[PDB]
Amino acid sequence: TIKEMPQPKTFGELKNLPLLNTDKPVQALMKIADELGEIFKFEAPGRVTRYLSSQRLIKEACDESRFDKNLSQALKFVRDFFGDGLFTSWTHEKNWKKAHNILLPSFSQQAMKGYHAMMVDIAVQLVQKWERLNADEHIEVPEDMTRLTLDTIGLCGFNYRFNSFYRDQPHPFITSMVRALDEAMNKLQRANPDDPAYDENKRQFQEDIKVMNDLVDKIIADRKASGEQSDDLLTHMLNGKDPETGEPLDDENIRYQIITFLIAGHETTSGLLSFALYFLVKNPHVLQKAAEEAARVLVDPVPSYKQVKQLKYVGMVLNEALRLWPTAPAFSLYAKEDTVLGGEYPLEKGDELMVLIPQLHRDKTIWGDDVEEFRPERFENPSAIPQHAFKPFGNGQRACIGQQFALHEATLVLGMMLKHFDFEDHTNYELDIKETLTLKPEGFVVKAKSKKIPLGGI
Ligand code: HEM
Numbered sequence: 001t002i003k004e005m006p007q008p009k010t011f012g013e014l015k016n017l018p019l020l021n022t023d024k025p026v027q028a029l030m031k032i033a034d035e036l037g038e039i040f041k042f043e044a045p046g047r048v049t050r051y052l053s054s055q056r057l058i059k060e061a062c063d064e065s066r067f068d069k070n071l072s073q074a075l076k077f078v079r080d081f082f083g084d085g086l087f088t089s090w091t092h093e094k095n096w097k098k099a100h101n102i103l104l105p106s107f108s109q110q111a112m113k114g115y116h117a118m119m120v121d122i123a124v125q126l127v128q129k130w131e132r133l134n135a136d137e138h139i140e141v142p143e144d145m146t147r148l149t150l151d152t153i154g155l156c157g158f159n160y161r162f163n164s165f166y167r168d169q170p171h172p173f174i175t176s177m178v179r180a181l182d183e184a185m186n187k188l189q190r191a192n193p194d195d196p197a198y199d200e201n202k203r204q205f206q207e208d209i210k211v212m213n214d215l216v217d218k219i220i221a222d223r224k225a226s227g228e229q230s231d232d233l234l235t236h237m238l239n240g241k242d243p244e245t246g247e248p249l250d251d252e253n254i255r256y257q258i259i260t261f262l263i264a265g266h267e268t269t270s271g272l273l274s275f276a277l278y279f280l281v282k283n284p285h286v287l288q289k290a291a292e293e294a295a296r297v298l299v300d301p302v303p304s305y306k307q308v309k310q311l312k313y314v315g316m317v318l319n320e321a322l323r324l325w326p327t328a329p330a331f332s333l334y335a336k337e338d339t340v341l342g343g344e345y346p347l348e349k350g351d352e353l354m355v356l357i358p359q360l361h362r363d364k365t366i367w368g369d370d371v372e373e374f375r376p377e378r379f380e381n382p383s384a385i386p387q388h389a390f391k392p393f394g395n396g397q398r399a400c401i402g403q404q405f406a407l408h409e410a411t412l413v414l415g416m417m418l419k420h421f422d423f424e425d426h427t428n429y430e431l432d433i434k435e436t437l438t439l440k441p442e443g444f445v446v447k448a449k450s451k452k453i454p455l456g457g458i
């Protein structure tokens with residue numbers, strides 16, 4: 001001995017399923033995890049997942065020799081349109097490593113230096129929009145963040161312009177992405193999909209996916225012509241060949257990586273830049289500190305690569321935002337063999353472990369008692385932080401390929417936002433967190449008066 005494991009309330013045949021009959025499943029699971037602690041079992045009709053909340057257990061699950069990435073029920077649903085791309089394939093699925101190798105040089109420090117110019121293009125457009133608002137007006141934060149993040153990935157990665165800033169409503173691709181992620185979440189809590197009560201759902205689902213796939217076609221079409229060709233993420237998808245297998249990617253898989261990187265390459269970064277600004281307005285002193293570093297370092301009209309790299313405190317602000325609200329709030333692992341977790345819990349081959357990231361980031365035994373407060377200075381000495389305490393970019397070889405992309409874009413943009421503007425929480429915003437598997441504040445609005453510093457170029 002050995003336990004034994006805590007389980008939340010059950011509802012007969014459906015077991016734990018009713019508990020997440022909410023538009024906010026992750027957040028509910030955090031509250032469940034507040035009461036039950038480090039580990040709890042969740043069972044739905046014919047599936048069982050153990051949710052982990054503590055560093056001492058999550059460090060173990062992060063042992064790549066014992067546990068490997070698992071497609072959760074969530075990821076299996078996302079696989080309907082993510083296909084067999086990097087996010088939704090098994091580690092030992094031929095197409096994972098093949099694509100990993102092929103696409104990896106598109107995230108090397110030399111690619112970032114080359115993505116910078118286009119990152120600034122989109123950032124300048126956002127600043128300009130904010131500069132051009134009338135005094136009677138406010139900024140819709142996540143809406144504008146999504147505008148930036150999608151346009152950024154679309155240009156740096158595909159040399160395609162979404163022109164999100166030439167639209168006052170969300171881009172159709174986003175509307176369709178949100179509806180498709182929204183359904184994926186809503187299949188988690190129904191376990192009766194056949195029912196023609198869900199006939200309209202799968203009709204709109206297929207409608208959304210076609211909208212997404214129609215865009216990919218335009219992206220590929222634009223590439224074939226072009227001429228003055230770039231050397232970006234798409235160029236590697238078409239021309240790169242994998243040393244191990246000696247193979248290029250097949251067209252079926254390319255289509256899936258375009259959809260994967262268009263979605264996973266912006267959505268969570270949008271959430272990050274939203275949550276980051278929110279915390280900064282709720283915490284006006286750290287904002288000031290961030291504004292000072294911004295102003296001191298960004299001495300040119302347009303930031304260089306080296307200058308973003310110098311925005312140290314901004315980096316800490318984004319990390320602390322990732323601590324409290326990691327925008328991809330969970331990842332799944334399975335036991336490679338029969339094993340015992342933390343000396344107390346016996347697991348069978350292929351049992352599921354969901355890492356509840358936000359709860360991991362609130363483990364008092366790691367972060368000290370003040371876990372709920374926003375304090376970027378925690379990351380002044382990361383060496384003190386134990387291994388596998390901070391995991392907002394996943395784990396191991398299945399960790400986020402686009403991590404430095406997200407951060408660099410988020411650092412540049414937040415840095416520029418703070419140089420050019422003073423922000424005001426005019427409505428005194430109360431945090432509502434929308435759940436689309438990913439996490440993002442809903443209705444978060446602010447006002448910005450211009451610091452009237454000039455811009456433009458590069
Ligand atoms: C704050 C911004 C971001 C967050 C919080 C984030 C979060 C994550 C997490 C938690 C995983 C691991 C998934 C899992 O274990 O199931 C992951 C993997 C991945 N992310 Fe990100 N990500 C971010 C930015 C990006 C960007 C900008 C891209 C595209 C350039 C991207 C593309 C991917 C891909 C392709 C994988 C899976 C790769 C593989 O398995 O080889 N991510 N991300």
Ligand SMILES: CCCCCCCCCCCCCCCC(=O)O
Nearest residue numbers: 025074188263264328329330437438
């Ligand atoms: C942009 C890529 C999207 C991939 C999804 C990443 C977010 C992790 C999944 C969160 C779902 C958590 C809800 C619990 C689901 C359940 O057990 O029923």
